[PDB]
């Protein structure tokens, strides 16, 4: 349980380095305000640029092989069985 803890410390450490690399690329983009005369055009044209931006990203991501071996899924399964027992009392 301790070695699968420190694997999840290290996998959350390397994606913390991924987001601060994305934070340093995002700070170069400056200020962009919005007026009243062209507010319907400056929010819907960029939504076409916004919905295209994760269309490549949700298709790049595979079903992720999360490395878990033993003694986490058993303890999460008993917590799942404890909430399944309360849900079948409430639906009764």
């Amino acid at each position: 349980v301790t070695n699968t803890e420190e694997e999840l410390i290290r996998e959350c450490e390397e994606m913390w380095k991924d987001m601060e690399e994305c934070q340093n690329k995002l700070s170069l983009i400056g200020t962009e305000t919005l007026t009243d005369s062209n507010a319907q055009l400056s929010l819907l044209i960029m939504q076409v640029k916004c919905l295209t931006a994760e269309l490549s990203q949700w298709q790049k991501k595979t079903p992720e092989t999360i490395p878990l071996t033993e003694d986490v899924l058993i303890t999460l399964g008993k917590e799942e069985f404890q909430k399944l027992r309360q849900d079948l009392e409430m639906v009764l």
Binding site: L8, C12, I29, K49, L51, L55, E89
Partner: protein, 112 residues
């Protein structure tokens, strides 16, 4: 229980990293901007939200299928060998089968 904290902060960090990467891909990738009508723009909005809903239910059903296969093999290796948690796990399965038998009789009488 620290493993729920590790999985919840891992899913939160994955969601924040995915929305940061989509914000960087929105700031760095552009479209050709022309003079267009509004209804073709909202038609592209509804077609893109149908396509992004299709790939999000594809990723959700494949990730949930991998999770249920790992939980099925984890419960198979759990109930292969008799352990010390069986004395409450057998009582929990007996209470779940009695509550499910009551839900079967209630569903049959309610349907008739």
């Amino acid at each position: 229980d620290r493993m729920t904290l590790l999985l919840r902060l891992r899913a939160q960090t994955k969601q924040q990293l995915l929305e940061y990467k989509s914000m960087v891909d929105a700031s760095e990738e552009k479209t050709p901007e022309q003079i267009m009508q509004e209804k073709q723009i909202e038609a592209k909005i509804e077609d893109l939200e149908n396509e992004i809903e299709e790939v999000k239910v594809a990723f959700e059903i494949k990730k949930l299928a991998l999770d249920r296969m790992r939980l099925s093999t984890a419960l198979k290796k759990n109930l292969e060998k008799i352990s010390r948690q069986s004395s409450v796990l057998m009582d929990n399965m007996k209470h779940l089968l009695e509550l499910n038998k009551l839900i079967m009789k209630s569903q049959q009488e309610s349907w008739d």
